[PDB]
Design brief:
This is part of a larger assembly, with two copies of chain A, three copies of chain B and two copies of chain C. Chain A contains one helix and two strands. The relative contact order of chain A is 0.20. Helix content of chain A is 22%, strand content 16%. By secondary structure, chain B is an all-alpha fold. Chain B starts with a helix and ends in a 40-residue tail after the last helix. Classes of the chains: A alpha+beta (51), B mainly alpha (50), C alpha+beta (228). The D-G interface holds D 22-26, 28-29, 31-32, 35-36, 38, 48 and G 39, 43-44, 74-75, 77-79, 81-82, 146-147, 149, 151, 158, 160, 164-166, 190. The structure holds ligand ECJ. It is classed as transferase/transferase inhibitor.
């Protein structure tokens, strides 16, 4: 039902919980890096420009 | 299972011989219905909406 | 210590275009208020456009109506550009009836007392057949910003009426704003600034009340900074 | 890229620009000179720095 | 013939104009290019790829 | 329609059937969002049967997943058309030009 | 058609002179509409008092040398701009700096007037070399509405009247239940000590409302 309160709960599980990001040809170990997740609207993944 | 049958006797629901297999709208996509077609195998009686 | 401005000449060209002067401004306040007003004007100004339209025969925006050369969502797109200003009503429903080989303009809508049509020449749809009948309910309401039709079917709670064509609503009466800050001379006062805001409307809202409500909003937001 | 253009544009200098030659107490008043339209981003200028 | 079409329209030959940041209201140093570029939407729509 | 074009916009739009091109020249008798009727000129008209060239337009129908293909009439009622004119644009065509 | 007003104005402050005030939620566009128009008042048009003009005892020129001081005359001027003066009921005051000896001359070494308050008595004005070496001068502070350079003076030191030393505003996203995107405004500000940051913001936006007084419906 996507009740409004599950969103506020999702922030709780998300906080100190890193996720892994991987881009297509994984050449060196940097092709998988762990980031802390930021809840964003829309269907796109937001990537830090320096990484 | 035992426990599920105990659940059947408490709230008294006639356990179905049938399983839900309806065509449902894929999650995330949304729009308007603009056509329905029904092709019925020859010999089956064409249903109401058909 | 600080000189405060007022609105002087408000020169109006077309019903859609206007040029508003703000005359007793200090150095730096021409641009400080000019942008922060352009920012308010374009984004958060009350106005009204059409929210929902019921068409007689049509079941949905992807149909055809015998006797009309416009597709239904082309007719819905014509209504999105219907410029109505309504008086003491928050939502009003209009009724459009016209038949014959004539283009159906916005003057062909039944006129309510509280309702004013800005563009009577505005084209809603054309009629090709002789006796080609069309009749519709168009539901206008006042609103702010840009409300899509997608976000309207969350509350819903039985909007089942299968023939109620929901349309996107772009309620801002502001189309375009530019502000040019030139020096102002008011007898003695070495250097002051004359702020000219130039703005285009859809005709529904008049320029003076727009600026008044623009700066009214601005004073209210600073209320959370007058204290903490 | 987008960023190194920015810093290269900052840490640049042109021959005769708004602010050419004034002396500023610290970096803070140097940003104050730029955001107020008084000093140009690239003008030779002595500033007290620590 | 391109610069000459711009003159006929009362537009600058450089095809660049002075632009203003709608956020702070302040002008942009240097003239940026503005003009009309035909742009497509390719069917890699994200709500398919996600 | 591209303001910046190259000229081929017509040749690509016309030759693929996504549009609706005039069989024979004449005047429009009736223009619906559905169909279009062209009263044929006598010189282009065949002796028996007489007749009028009638083009039924494609309306909102499914493509090879998942996109749509829908045609729109681009002539107004009682307008002269000649052989090879565009009676109805299709998807990504405006007035007979490739508008992708 | 009533508008959104912010809540929870949490005020995380580093020192009395520095502060960072976060205030959410704003309607969309209001981060920059309020953030910018407030930075513009703070930076450019803010009442204050700093050092405007100084007459020097030993020399009449800014491009000279003073016997007994290791700072160049124009280096002492940078110290004067960074003298944080708050004056009470006086519109023009003149101070006296009487001091000699092998000591650095601080702002506590200025005569303490009734209407004059020095924010940094520890503040360093200039240094004194060997022997006694005599130095004493009268320094005149002036009121202003912003930052007036000496270049714009036609009838000299730069005058930083605005108590702001630096202002920046950062706009980040805010979430309010079912309200996808709003604006959370982060204001960070440095003062010269005369007015503290919290009251500076209050007086900054009051000025803005006064300009709008002829428009509020
Ligand atoms: N680890 C990855 N990192 C970045 N991109 C990836 C990764 N894996 C798949 N893609 C993209 O996903 C499809 C292919 O997926 P798959 O190979 O068929 O496998 P599975 O069916 O199981 O998803 C392509 O993208 P596209 O179809 O848009 O076309 P493209 O290759 O030119 O980018 C791939 O780039």
């Amino acid at each position: 039902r996507e009740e409004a309160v599950v969103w506020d709960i999702l922030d709780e599980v998300i906080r100190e919980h890193p996720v892994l990001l991987n881009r297509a040809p994984t050449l060196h170990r940097l092709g998988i890096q762990a980031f802390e997740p930021v809840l964003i609207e829309g269907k796109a993944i937001q990537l830090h420009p320096l990484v | 299972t035992p426990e599920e049958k105990l659940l059947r006797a408490i709230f008294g629901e006639k356990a179905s011989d049938v399983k839900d297999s309806s065509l449902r709208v894929p999650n995330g996509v949304s729009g308007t219905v603009i056509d329905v077609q029904v092709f019925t195998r020859d010999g089956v009686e064409k249903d109401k909406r058909a | 210590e600080f000189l405060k401005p007022r609105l002087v000449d408000i020169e109006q060209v077309s019903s859609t275009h206007a040029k508003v002067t703000l005359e007793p401004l200090e150095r730096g306040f021409g641009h400080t208020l000019g942008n922060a007003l352009r920012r308010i004007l374009l984004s958060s100004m009350p106005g009204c456009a059409v929210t929902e339209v019921e068409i007689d025969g049509v079941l949905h925006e992807y149909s055809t109506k015998e006797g009309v050369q416009e597709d239904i969502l082309e007719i819905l797109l014509n209504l999105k550009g219907l410029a109505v200003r309504v008086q003491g009503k928050d939502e009003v429903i209009l009724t459009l009836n016209k038949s014959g080989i004539g283009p159906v303009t916005a003057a062909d809508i039944t006129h309510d007392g509280d309702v004013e049509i800005v563009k009577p020449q505005h084209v809603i749809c054309h009629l090709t057949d002789e006796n080609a009948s069309i009749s519709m309910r168009i539901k206008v309401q006042r609103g702010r910003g840009y409300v899509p039709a997608s976000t309207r079917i969350h509350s819903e709670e039985d909007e089942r009426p299968i023939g109620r064509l929901l349309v996107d609503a772009c309620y801002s009466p502001v189309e375009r704003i530019a502000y040019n800050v030139e020096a102002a001379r008011v007898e003695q006062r070495t250097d002051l600034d004359k702020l000219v805001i130039e703005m285009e409307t859809n005709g529904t809202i008049d320029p003076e009340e727009a600026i008044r409500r623009a700066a009214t909003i601005l004073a209210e937001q600073l209320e959370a900074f007058v204290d903490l | 890229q987008d960023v190194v253009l920015g810093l290269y544009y900052m840490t640049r200098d042109c021959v005769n620009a708004k602010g050419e030659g004034m002396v500023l107490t610290g970096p803070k008043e140097a940003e104050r000179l730029y955001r107020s339209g008084l000093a140009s981003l690239h003008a030779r200028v002595k500033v007290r720095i620590t | 013939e391109i610069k000459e079409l711009l003159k006929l329209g009362d537009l600058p030959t450089s095809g660049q104009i002075r632009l203003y940041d709608g956020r702070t209201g302040e002008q942009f140093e240097r003239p940026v290019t503005v003009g009309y570029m035909y742009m497509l939407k390719l069917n890699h729509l994200v709500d398919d790829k996600m | 329609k591209p303001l910046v074009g190259t000229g081929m916009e017509r040749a690509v739009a016309v030759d693929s059937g996504v549009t609706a091109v005039a069989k024979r020249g004449g005047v429009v008798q009736y223009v619906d969002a559905s169909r279009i009727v062209i009263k044929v000129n006598e010189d282009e008209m065949y002796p028996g049967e007489a007749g009028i060239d009638i083009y039924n337009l494609t309306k909102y129908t499914r493509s090879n997943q998942n996109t749509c293909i829908n045609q729109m009439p681009c002539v107004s009622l009682g307008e002269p058309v000649e052989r090879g004119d565009v009676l109805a644009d299709g998807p990504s065509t405006d007035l007979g030009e490739l508008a992708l």
